[PDB]
Amino acid sequence: LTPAELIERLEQAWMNEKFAPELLESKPEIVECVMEQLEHMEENLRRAKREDLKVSIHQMEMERIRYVLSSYLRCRLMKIEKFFPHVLEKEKTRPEGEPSSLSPEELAFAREFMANTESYLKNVALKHMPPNLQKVDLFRAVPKPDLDSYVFLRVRERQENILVEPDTDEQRDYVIDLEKGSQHLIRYKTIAPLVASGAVQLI
């Protein structure tokens, strides 16, 4: 709501996106609002005289904001290009009411990338293959996101009865509780709903 809080939410999303091994859910509202803030401030500095001290201070503020927005968007684009069949198929499968992992422009870019890559391979080598070998399945060839990755985190709300599984023998299963303001090192797969819900932060 107030601009200070909007900037704080952007800087939170930036770090979650860095350390999570998958493409996290989309945030169209934040991107639209931050962009119109930059457009508005630019026109305000354009209307005043350019020699003054406070104008330079305002310009420095804008550079700091624009860097975070750019960095965040670059990272999401790496993950789209790397896992294209999987994100496309998941969006095609999605049930109603659940949020998408892709904004509409990101989805458009992904569809273009898929078509382009398939066409290149078909024209360069596969049309020359024997008739029984001219088809290949990119859904099988391209690897999958590795959710068993280890991560550091810090908790913002208390949580209770979280199950930890060493190895995969049930005789070693046990549960722990996450106290307010503490920091832990644990496998990403166990905590994945907490990151999506906003209960924890990756650091």
Binding site: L38, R66, L69, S70, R74, F113
Partner: peptide
């Protein structure tokens, strides 16, 4: 395709995200 995506990000004529590769220290 990439140039099409950047031009659509917001405002008028978007944002060239291929720049600001390092955090800024001075004007």
């Amino acid at each position: 395709s990439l140039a099409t995506y950047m031009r659509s990000l917001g405002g008028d004529e978007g944002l060239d995200i291929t720049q600001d590769m390092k955090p800024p220290k001075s004007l």
